[PDB]
Amino acid sequence: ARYTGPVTRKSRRLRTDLVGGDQAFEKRPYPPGQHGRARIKESEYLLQLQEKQKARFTYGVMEKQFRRYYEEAVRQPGKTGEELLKILESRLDNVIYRAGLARTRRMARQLVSHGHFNVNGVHVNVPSYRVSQYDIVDVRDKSLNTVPFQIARETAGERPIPSWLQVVGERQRVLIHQLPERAQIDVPLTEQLIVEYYSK
Amino acid sequence: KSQQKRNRTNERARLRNKAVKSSLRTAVRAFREAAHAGDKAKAAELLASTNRKLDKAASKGVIHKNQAANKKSALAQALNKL
Amino acid sequence: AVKIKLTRLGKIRNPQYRVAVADARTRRDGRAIEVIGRYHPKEEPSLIEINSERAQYWLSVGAQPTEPVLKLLKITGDWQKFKGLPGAQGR
RNA sequence: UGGAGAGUUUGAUCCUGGCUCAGGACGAACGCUGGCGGCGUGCUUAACACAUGCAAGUCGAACGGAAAGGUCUCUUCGGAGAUACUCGAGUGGCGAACGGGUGAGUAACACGUGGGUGAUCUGCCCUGCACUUCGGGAUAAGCCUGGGAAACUGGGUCUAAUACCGGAUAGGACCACGGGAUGCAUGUCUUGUGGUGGAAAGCGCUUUAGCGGUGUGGGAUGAGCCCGCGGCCUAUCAGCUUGUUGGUGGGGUGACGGCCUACCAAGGCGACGACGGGUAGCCGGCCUGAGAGGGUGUCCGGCCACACUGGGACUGAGAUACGGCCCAGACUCCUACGGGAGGCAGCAGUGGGGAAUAUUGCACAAUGGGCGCAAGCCUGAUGCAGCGACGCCGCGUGGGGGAUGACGGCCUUCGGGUUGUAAACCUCUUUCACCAUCGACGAAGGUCCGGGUUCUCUCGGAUUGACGGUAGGUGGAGAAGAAGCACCGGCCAACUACGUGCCAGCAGCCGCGGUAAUACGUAGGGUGCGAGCGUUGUCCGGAAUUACUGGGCGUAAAGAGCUCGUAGGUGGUUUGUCGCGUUGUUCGUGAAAUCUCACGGCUUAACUGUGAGCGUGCGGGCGAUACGGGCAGACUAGAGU
Ligand SMILES: [Mg+2]
Ligand SMILES: [Mg+2]
Ligand SMILES: [Mg+2]
Ligand SMILES: [Mg+2]
Ligand SMILES: [Mg+2]
Ligand SMILES: [Mg+2]
Ligand SMILES: [Mg+2]
Ligand SMILES: [Mg+2]
Ligand SMILES: [Mg+2]
Ligand SMILES: [Mg+2]
Ligand SMILES: [Mg+2]
Ligand SMILES: [Mg+2]
Ligand SMILES: [Mg+2]
Ligand SMILES: [Mg+2]
Ligand SMILES: [Mg+2]
Ligand SMILES: [Mg+2]
Ligand SMILES: [Mg+2]
Ligand SMILES: [Mg+2]
Ligand SMILES: [Mg+2]
Ligand SMILES: [Mg+2]
Ligand SMILES: [Mg+2]
Ligand SMILES: [Mg+2]
Ligand SMILES: [Mg+2]
Ligand SMILES: [Mg+2]
Ligand SMILES: [Mg+2]
Ligand SMILES: [Mg+2]
Ligand SMILES: [Mg+2]
Ligand SMILES: [Mg+2]
Ligand SMILES: [Mg+2]
Ligand SMILES: [Mg+2]
Ligand SMILES: [Mg+2]
Ligand SMILES: [Mg+2]
Ligand SMILES: [Mg+2]
Ligand SMILES: [Mg+2]
Ligand SMILES: [Mg+2]
Ligand SMILES: [Mg+2]
Ligand SMILES: [Mg+2]
Ligand SMILES: [Mg+2]
Ligand SMILES: [Mg+2]
Ligand SMILES: [Mg+2]
Ligand SMILES: [Mg+2]
Ligand SMILES: [Mg+2]
Ligand SMILES: [Mg+2]
Ligand SMILES: [Mg+2]
Ligand SMILES: [Mg+2]
Ligand SMILES: [Mg+2]
Ligand SMILES: [Mg+2]
Ligand SMILES: [Mg+2]
Ligand SMILES: [Mg+2]
Ligand SMILES: [Mg+2]
Ligand SMILES: [Mg+2]
Ligand SMILES: [Mg+2]
Ligand SMILES: [Mg+2]
Ligand SMILES: [Mg+2]
Ligand SMILES: [Mg+2]
């Protein structure tokens, strides 16, 4: 399933904005509800809970799938938080967002869902597809010249391109030099609280 | 079902095997009587005839070769001890 | 007797096969005496490797291959090597 | 490479110590809700009783034959002709002991692991060496009859065989005497002489169609039997045993053996739990856990046991002989009352029990299996499909802008706040569903035709897929067809209003409700999760509350009233040796799957393949001798005189 709900409420509860763009701010404080102005007790469970919430709603992942991503990360050699970030970052729709082909995360997800991309000449339409090192991502050649994809053809200058993927000329294609390192790539969160949440 | 054919052939085989084994048993008891008498004269060829019959039964497949050999050894030693 | 057969150990629609030396009085996916190869009927023609000396050992000692296994042995040339025929490789 | 705590005994405190909760899991059930796909999974209770259909046949290249089809065939003009492909019934071979089901029994060499078999067997298959030689009498079937209600059965004639029987020759049969090797006591293996013995089967041929048969040496395979070690509760079960323990001679077996028998001796097992009672199929594994442990044995795989209940044998290479035979018993049915028939713990299905578990489906296309020279024929194995959110995984119910703070709801200190960029509206894309269309891989295969003579090889041709006109691809219009469930006092994220007023009710704990309830019911709001969400049941965790890792006994539960002493456990200093413990290394084994790490393939994932780990162990060889232990000594410090 998908959330498909007001994103501003979900940012206002977690006290952090996760969207940016044209609807970057709601131009008002953060009382997320009717009692949203209350100065409430701050438990230790709450910090871990809301950090994992930020991690999930940054990417639109569902709890059952994030849980599996957690076992993958903790079971991977190395560390845990950076591996969790790397796994959550290698998602193909996230790659589409970070390669400057998307206004937001939701619409990048919809473009991946509607099958507007081919990786090794393979038509993929699963958002949770995981990209890999030396993967090329190609837009479906019969899908270009369409308005929401060509509106991102000329607006490829403002949001920076990270240093693990790469975009090329008018044929908008993506090359992955190596797997990312999200800890040095745009963390609006601390990965050390997800680990503590998944220990109780 | 058509195992009735097997049912009939099993009965025929049972009759043949029964007849053969009974004949060997009579031969063996006759030799035992001869050895108990101990004349050593007629037993000397009753042993040959009985061993021949045991071998023939083993070749016919009514008994097993090892059983035939066991009985032949026992009877030959019984003769030698008399 | 002793057979060289194909045991289906893939999934519901991808019939992977192992080339196993098994006694005939054994279920298809039973305990094999010795696995000596594999056969995948889904690749470019297909995927086929046989040990080619354990295969020779079993053929020499008396195992009778089933008919698809005979086809694979003819493809790989082990059957021709064993019987004494010219073409020892035909893939 | 992995370990979290919280509430509750008191006016308060610190300990001790129970109880309870937060996690995970399920072959699940129930409540509300419910879009799709992929891959799994589905009688846990009555091993209760079963209507119906199907689950084991095949060979005419073994045989006599001619019920059926096709024939050249005569001719009846509706009947003829085994000579003739072909073939119902029948004799004969092989198969039917596998495959499939269930877990009742079983505490046992049943299972797991490692050995032994000089104590054994093994159809078909591979392979070496020999041979395949003479005869003879019947009967099935047919035909004529008899008995019986049936189920079946008696007689007379009549005919074969690779059916049956008797001979000749043939060493791995036997007896006696010897040699040569080896050892682990019986012995084993190989040889020499003498004396006794033991088989066979033929059929076919478009002309190098081809199938066969018997004795033996050696392989492979499968199996039997014996042993070490390992895995439940119970002493409020303490005496069990007379073929019992052992021996000798016989018998029996494929094989050792009290396996059996006659005789002889008087032993055997037991506190390291005999005998008895309860429960239970065992394991690879599965769940949990930081680990050690605990629970469990369901899908899948291996082994065992059983087939209405109890007993027995026959045939055979091989029998718990599920769809074989005999007997007894219970049950259901037929009967002419004399007598007969049956066995879903095979697939599907019915009743019943139950909280609860599926279609009387398709195909032999693929793999495995049986018979056949082969084509072929059989296969409810198997390959798939149907049904059930029963489970795991994946994807949808849109996206980009937009304070009318729309409208309304609710709260308000009546000022405003909230739902809330959320809607309206503008615009964009159509994953899945819908419509139309093309259409698979699984098949380097199976068949007949051509080079190739055959064997082997392509060649090309038809033709062959249950799944399936499915997956998938392509195209069309449209935000278009698609969200719910639980909770919000603390644990534990999430708060107010109204109604109610120890009532109605809630509750895992302790508690909440007797007139201003964040704990009852509704509303608004919020939180978690999401095609699911809650409850119940069960297991582990938390629980260091059975403590090996890893706890205790002055007063919290806990030192026997005290001593002596049996088995047992433990043991001072020192020398030598052994190498049992211990430790090093190597070989074998520890099946596959599952698990971990890395890739590879399904659009991803679940799932699947490959490689390495793991498999803690056990057995064999070869090293070490510090410590433990054994064996042979020494010493006086402990102990005693
Ligand atoms: Mg027959
Ligand atoms: Mg008599
Ligand atoms: Mg004897
Ligand atoms: Mg008190
Ligand atoms: Mg006090
Ligand atoms: Mg406590
Ligand atoms: Mg049952
Ligand atoms: Mg016939
Ligand atoms: Mg035959
Ligand atoms: Mg048989
Ligand atoms: Mg059976
Ligand atoms: Mg059982
Ligand atoms: Mg054992
Ligand atoms: Mg007659
Ligand atoms: Mg002779
Ligand atoms: Mg003869
Ligand atoms: Mg006695
Ligand atoms: Mg005796
Ligand atoms: Mg039981
Ligand atoms: Mg623990
Ligand atoms: Mg029984
Ligand atoms: Mg029954
Ligand atoms: Mg019985
Ligand atoms: Mg046989
Ligand atoms: Mg027999
Ligand atoms: Mg029986
Ligand atoms: Mg039965
Ligand atoms: Mg049956
Ligand atoms: Mg049977
Ligand atoms: Mg059934
Ligand atoms: Mg009920
Ligand atoms: Mg009922
Ligand atoms: Mg088939
Ligand atoms: Mg077949
Ligand atoms: Mg339900
Ligand atoms: Mg809270
Ligand atoms: Mg009130
Ligand atoms: Mg309430
Ligand atoms: Mg899901
Ligand atoms: Mg507990
Ligand atoms: Mg514990
Ligand atoms: Mg302790
Ligand atoms: Mg204590
Ligand atoms: Mg003490
Ligand atoms: Mg006291
Ligand atoms: Mg006390
Ligand atoms: Mg005292
Ligand atoms: Mg003592
Ligand atoms: Mg002592
Ligand atoms: Mg001692
Ligand atoms: Mg000492
Ligand atoms: Mg393994
Ligand atoms: Mg891949
Ligand atoms: Mg060793
Ligand atoms: Mg002294």
UniProtKB/Swiss-Prot annotation, chain A:
Q: Where is the S4 RNA-binding domain?
A: 90-156
The record's subunit annotation is:
Part of the 30S ribosomal subunit. Contacts protein S5. The interaction surface between S4 and S5 is involved in control of translational fidelity.
This protein's name: Small ribosomal subunit protein uS4
Can you name the source organism? Answer: Mycobacterium tuberculosis (strain ATCC 25618 / H37Rv)
PANTHER family linked to this entry = 30S 40S RIBOSOMAL PROTEIN, SMALL RIBOSOMAL SUBUNIT PROTEIN US4M
Q: Which UniProt keywords apply?
A: Ribonucleoprotein, Ribosomal protein, RNA-binding, rRNA-binding
Annotated gene? rpsD
The family this protein is said to belong to? Belongs to the universal ribosomal protein uS4 family.
Other facts: Was identified as a high-confidence drug target.
Task: Supply one GO CC term from the record.
Answer: peptidoglycan-based cell wall
Cited function: One of the primary rRNA binding proteins, it binds directly to 16S rRNA where it nucleates assembly of the body of the 30S subunit. With S5 and S12 plays an important role in translational accuracy.
> In its UniProt record, which GO terms are filed under biological process?
ribosomal small subunit biogenesis; translation
Recorded GO terms, molecular function? rRNA binding; structural constituent of ribosome
Signal peptide positions on this chain? none
InterPro entries given in the database record: Ribosomal_uS4, Ribosomal_uS4_bac-type, Ribosomal_uS4_CS, Ribosomal_uS4_N, S4_RNA-bd, S4_RNA-bd_sf
Read off the Gene3D superfamilies from this record.
Answer: Ribosomal Protein S4 Delta 41, Chain A, domain 1, RNA-binding S4 domain
Q: Return the NCBIfam families for the record.
A: PRK05327.1, rpsD_bact
Swiss-Prot record, chain B:
Q: Which UniProt keywords apply?
A: Ribonucleoprotein, Ribosomal protein, RNA-binding, rRNA-binding
Care to name a GO molecular-function term for this sequence?
small ribosomal subunit rRNA binding
Q: Which InterPro entries match?
A: Ribosomal_bS20, Ribosomal_bS20_sf
GO CC terms for this protein?
cytosol; small ribosomal subunit
* Region of interest: Disordered: 1-21
Q: Which domain of life is it from?
A: Bacteria
* One example of a Gene Ontology biological process annotation: translation
Q: Which family does it belong to?
A: Belongs to the bacterial ribosomal protein bS20 family.
* Other noteworthy facts: Was identified as a high-confidence drug target.
Its biological function? Binds directly to 16S ribosomal RNA.
What name goes with this protein?
Answer: Small ribosomal subunit protein bS20
Its taxonomic path starts at: Bacteria, Bacillati, Actinomycetota, Actinomycetes, Mycobacteriales
From Swiss-Prot, chain C:
The alphabetical list of record keywords is: Ribonucleoprotein, Ribosomal protein
GO terms for biological process? Answer: translation
Return the similarity comment: Belongs to the bacterial ribosomal protein bS16 family.
Quote one Gene Ontology molecular function term. Answer: structural constituent of ribosome
- The molecule here is called Small ribosomal subunit protein bS16
Q: Pull one GO CC term from this UniProt entry.
A: cytoplasm
Q: Which organism is it from?
A: Mycobacterium tuberculosis (strain ATCC 25618 / H37Rv)
